[PDB]
Amino acid sequence: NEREALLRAIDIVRDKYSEKGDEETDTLLHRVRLDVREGNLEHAVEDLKKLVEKR
Amino acid sequence: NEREALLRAIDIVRDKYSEKGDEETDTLLHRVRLDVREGNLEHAVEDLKKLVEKR
Amino acid sequence: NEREALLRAIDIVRDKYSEKGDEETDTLLHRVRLDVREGNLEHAVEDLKKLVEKR
Ligand SMILES: [Zn+2]
Ligand SMILES: [Zn+2]
Ligand SMILES: [Zn+2]
Numbered sequence: 001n002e003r004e005a006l007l008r009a010i011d012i013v014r015d016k017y018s019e020k021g022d023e024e025t026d027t028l029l030h031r032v033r034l035d036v037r038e039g040n041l042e043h044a045v046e047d048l049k050k051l052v053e054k055r
Numbered sequence: 056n057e058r059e060a061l062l063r064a065i066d067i068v069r070d071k072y073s074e075k076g077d078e079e080t081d082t083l084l085h086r087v088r089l090d091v092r093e094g095n096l097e098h099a100v101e102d103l104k105k106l107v108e109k110r
Numbered sequence: 111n112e113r114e115a116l117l118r119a120i121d122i123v124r125d126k127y128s129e130k131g132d133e134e135t136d137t138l139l140h141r142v143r144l145d146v147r148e149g150n151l152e153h154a155v156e157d158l159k160k161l162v163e164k165r
Contacts, residue, residue, distance in 0.1 A: 011150070014153075015153055015156075018153065018156055018157060019156075021160070023160075026157075027141070030141050030144070031082070031085050034085070034089070034144075040066070043066075043069070043070060043073065046070075046073050046074065047073060047081075050076070086137070086140055089140070089144070095121075098124075098125065098128065101125075101128050102128075102136075105131070
């Protein structure tokens with residue numbers, strides 16, 4: 001299904017920014033991953049959008 | 056259900072504080088939602104009450 | 111269940127770090143318990159490793 005495929009993508013990028021010692025982008029995709037999994041897809045986009053806009 | 060009503064109520068306030076760009080409150084209600092959703096409410100009021108007294 | 115034993119261990123130390131009001135360590139073991147509860151044990155050790163080295 002689509003959602004567990006999404007759960008794959010967040011896992012790849014989240015681990016990558018944990019290595020770089022990025023505890024502002026690693027803590028963030030911990031939040032986004034939970035929202036996608038529970039079904040709060042709308043809130044996930046709002047949370048992620050500000051980071052992309054900023055950096 | 057008792058816990059289902061609580062879960063929606065946190066979502067109402069949580070969304071309201073992500074649009075305002077508040078990354079202290081919006082981050083905090085991510086944790087409080089998970090504490091209630093899992094069955095550890097006593098730790099939720101420990102995390103929640105410190106924000107209320109501070110703000 | 112052996113994962114339940116790990117989850118109990120995280121609880122004991124997590125509440126031990128909420129009385130002191132340590133909001134660096136406490137928010138960290140929120141993520142670690144979430145990592146262990148789902149199966150991302152490989153990320154949990156890397157997440158917790160950084161805290162051990164500093165402190
Ligand atoms: Zn991480
Ligand atoms: Zn949010
Ligand atoms: Zn806590």
